[PDB]
Design an enzyme around this catalytic site. Sequence first.
Site, short mmCIF file in Angstrom:
data_model
loop_
_atom_site.label_atom_id
_atom_site.label_comp_id
_atom_site.label_asym_id
_atom_site.label_seq_id
_atom_site.Cartn_x
_atom_site.Cartn_y
_atom_site.Cartn_z
N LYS A 161 -0.99 -4.94 14.73
CA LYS A 161 -0.37 -4.66 16.06
C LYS A 161 -1.19 -3.62 16.83
O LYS A 161 -1.33 -3.77 18.07
CB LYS A 161 1.09 -4.24 15.89
CG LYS A 161 1.98 -5.35 15.35
CD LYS A 161 1.73 -6.68 15.99
CE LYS A 161 2.97 -7.53 16.13
NZ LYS A 161 2.76 -8.64 17.09
N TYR A 215 0.40 -5.33 8.74
CA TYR A 215 1.30 -5.58 9.91
C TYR A 215 0.99 -4.56 11.01
O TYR A 215 0.65 -4.98 12.11
CB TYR A 215 2.80 -5.49 9.59
CG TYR A 215 3.63 -5.72 10.83
CD1 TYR A 215 3.59 -6.95 11.46
CD2 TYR A 215 4.39 -4.73 11.40
CE1 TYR A 215 4.31 -7.19 12.61
CE2 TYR A 215 5.13 -4.95 12.54
CZ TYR A 215 5.10 -6.19 13.15
OH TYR A 215 5.82 -6.45 14.28
N1 NAP Z 1 10.98 -8.80 13.95
C1 NAP Z 1 11.23 -7.81 14.81
O1 NAP Z 1 12.33 -7.37 15.01
C2 NAP Z 1 10.09 -7.30 15.60
C3 NAP Z 1 9.89 -5.98 15.92
C4 NAP Z 1 8.78 -5.68 16.70
C5 NAP Z 1 7.93 -6.67 17.12
N2 NAP Z 1 8.15 -7.93 16.79
C6 NAP Z 1 7.33 -9.04 17.22
O2 NAP Z 1 8.17 -10.04 17.81
C7 NAP Z 1 7.76 -11.33 17.42
C8 NAP Z 1 8.91 -12.31 17.33
O3 NAP Z 1 9.60 -12.06 16.12
P1 NAP Z 1 10.62 -12.99 15.39
O4 NAP Z 1 11.47 -11.88 14.98
O5 NAP Z 1 10.98 -14.08 16.34
O6 NAP Z 1 9.78 -13.54 14.17
P2 NAP Z 1 10.29 -14.65 13.15
O7 NAP Z 1 11.34 -15.49 13.76
O8 NAP Z 1 10.56 -13.94 11.90
O9 NAP Z 1 8.96 -15.53 13.10
C9 NAP Z 1 7.93 -15.42 14.11
C10 NAP Z 1 7.73 -16.66 15.01
O10 NAP Z 1 6.37 -17.07 15.20
C11 NAP Z 1 6.13 -18.34 14.64
N3 NAP Z 1 4.87 -18.40 13.87
C12 NAP Z 1 4.61 -17.80 12.74
N4 NAP Z 1 3.38 -18.04 12.33
C13 NAP Z 1 2.82 -18.83 13.20
C14 NAP Z 1 1.52 -19.47 13.39
N5 NAP Z 1 0.54 -19.34 12.51
N6 NAP Z 1 1.34 -20.20 14.46
C15 NAP Z 1 2.30 -20.35 15.34
N7 NAP Z 1 3.49 -19.82 15.25
C16 NAP Z 1 3.82 -19.07 14.22
C17 NAP Z 1 7.27 -18.59 13.74
O11 NAP Z 1 7.41 -19.97 13.49
P3 NAP Z 1 7.65 -20.50 12.04
O12 NAP Z 1 9.07 -20.64 12.04
O13 NAP Z 1 6.93 -21.72 11.94
O14 NAP Z 1 7.23 -19.44 11.14
C18 NAP Z 1 8.38 -17.92 14.50
O15 NAP Z 1 8.67 -18.57 15.71
C19 NAP Z 1 7.16 -11.10 16.05
O16 NAP Z 1 6.25 -12.16 15.70
C20 NAP Z 1 6.60 -9.67 16.04
O17 NAP Z 1 5.19 -9.57 16.20
C21 NAP Z 1 9.20 -8.24 16.05
#
Ligand code: NAP
Lengths: 221, 223
Positions: free
Chosen positions: A157, A153
Amino acid sequence: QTYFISGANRGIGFSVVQRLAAKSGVKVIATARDPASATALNELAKENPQVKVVQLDISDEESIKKIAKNVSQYTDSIDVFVSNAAIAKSFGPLLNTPREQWIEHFFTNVLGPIRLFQELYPLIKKGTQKKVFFISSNAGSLNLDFGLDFSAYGQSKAALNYSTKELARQLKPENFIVAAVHPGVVTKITPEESAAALCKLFESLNTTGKYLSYDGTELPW
Amino acid sequence: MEQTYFISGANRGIGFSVVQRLAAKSGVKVIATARDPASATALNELAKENPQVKVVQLDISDEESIKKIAKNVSQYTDSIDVFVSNAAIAKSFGPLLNTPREQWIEHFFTNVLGPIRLFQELYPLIKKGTQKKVFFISSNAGSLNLDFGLDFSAYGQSKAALNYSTKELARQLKPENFIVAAVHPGVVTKITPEESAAALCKLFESLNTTGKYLSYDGTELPW
Ligand SMILES: NC(=O)c1ccc[n+]([C@@H]2O[C@H](COP(=O)([O-])OP(=O)(O)OC[C@H]3O[C@@H](n4cnc5c(N)ncnc54)[C@H](OP(=O)(O)O)[C@@H]3O)[C@@H](O)[C@H]2O)c1
Ligand SMILES: NC(=O)c1ccc[n+]([C@@H]2O[C@H](COP(=O)([O-])OP(=O)(O)OC[C@H]3O[C@@H](n4cnc5c(N)ncnc54)[C@H](OP(=O)(O)O)[C@@H]3O)[C@@H](O)[C@H]2O)c1
């Protein structure tokens, strides 16, 4: 203004699209792996038809190879690109991180967004804001210590952070605004709060090369 | 007082000069790897004159070669004192938009996953030795905080990725009294591979602290 968001079916992605749809004369290209199962997103776009729902799986080269055509159906240009779609599946020690975890975060979290950007650059170039946002993590810094290991992870990043920085350099002479952004953890914050901060950040940000937390403060690469 | 060193990619460049520098020390066994030993003329000649130099086949891009390195190194030694991940590629520079899919993949597999997997396989041999030194040959180009004006594309990305994971590994293995370092070997103003090798071997012997990003001269680089 046409915004593009990968991974809009749920999480921060859905929360960003939902906020963009509220705003006067914003067209939103919003992606899901399986748009037919993206109940909440589709519902959003029926309620707000300026929201267009396109298929994208960033782990699938053949899906990325169609994104330009699929987006070309609804817009001649992108103003603001947001690489949000990402995975976060492997943490902890390197000795305990198998091959597959490393490969998957590479393809999905690094190559994915680089190919996505490569495909959509001609549409971004034609647009007015020329704003490019990769949703990174603070866990991706080479200079922050969280008292945690982030395995594939964090590595993923950091890799995308490296290339973001390089892309910011390369596209400066085309008045592009390239940023890596930590959306927060969702001290935890709501998708709605993350979204609000990011939408504000997406409109306000005027300089390229930045690594920003959602609040608009800089992070060390 | 006998020490075993392990060097990936010892058939040419910095790798060969390190094995050559090491072969000259007494009480130092050297496990030198080559993708294709048969055609490693200089390294085979080194080993023919220096029985303490053991040549072994390794392709760090190939999971099937990595699955074999532990058992094969184990025919020649019971432990590794100093692990050096030197084998790498540098086949991708210039802008992100001009870097095709395949160069990103190859740099990931050869420059990030190769060394991780190689270390995973060789860790138990290294646990069993005295020095517990673990060096990844990195680049200043992998720094997230140096600007050289040049584009390093997939090469630099691969060196940043391995850097990130190297730093995490230094944390994980501090409790087992491992010394883990990323090392810039110099650009070969240029130095020669033999000068790089002399400075690197000094560093391997002297480094007594984990978690450093170093240049060949022992000065620190920012992550
Ligand atoms: N989680 C955090 O609090 C946090 C902290 C720092 C940075 N971030 C970044 O913020 C982003 C958004 O996070 P989130 O919390 O919204 O994540 P999440 O809801 O847990 O899932 C990530 C999103 O990306 C989609 N996705 C996953 N794999 C994919 C693929 N192969 N192709 C296309 N779409 C795909 C997912 O769709 P599906 O539903 O189909 O999986 C979902 O919309 C993260 O992906 C991460 O890099 C997050
Ligand atoms: N040269 C520089 O100025 C410089 C600067 C910064 C960092 N470095 C780093 O220093 C290290 C040494 O590089 P070098 O200058 O000696 O360059 P080099 O000549 O390219 O070194 C490559 C060595 O690694 C081997 N190798 C390559 N791919 C391999 C694979 N898939 N599996 C196993 N072995 C493989 C090569 O063998 P083959 O003959 O099979 O290709 C060769 O022995 C590298 O990790 C490099 O990234 C070098």
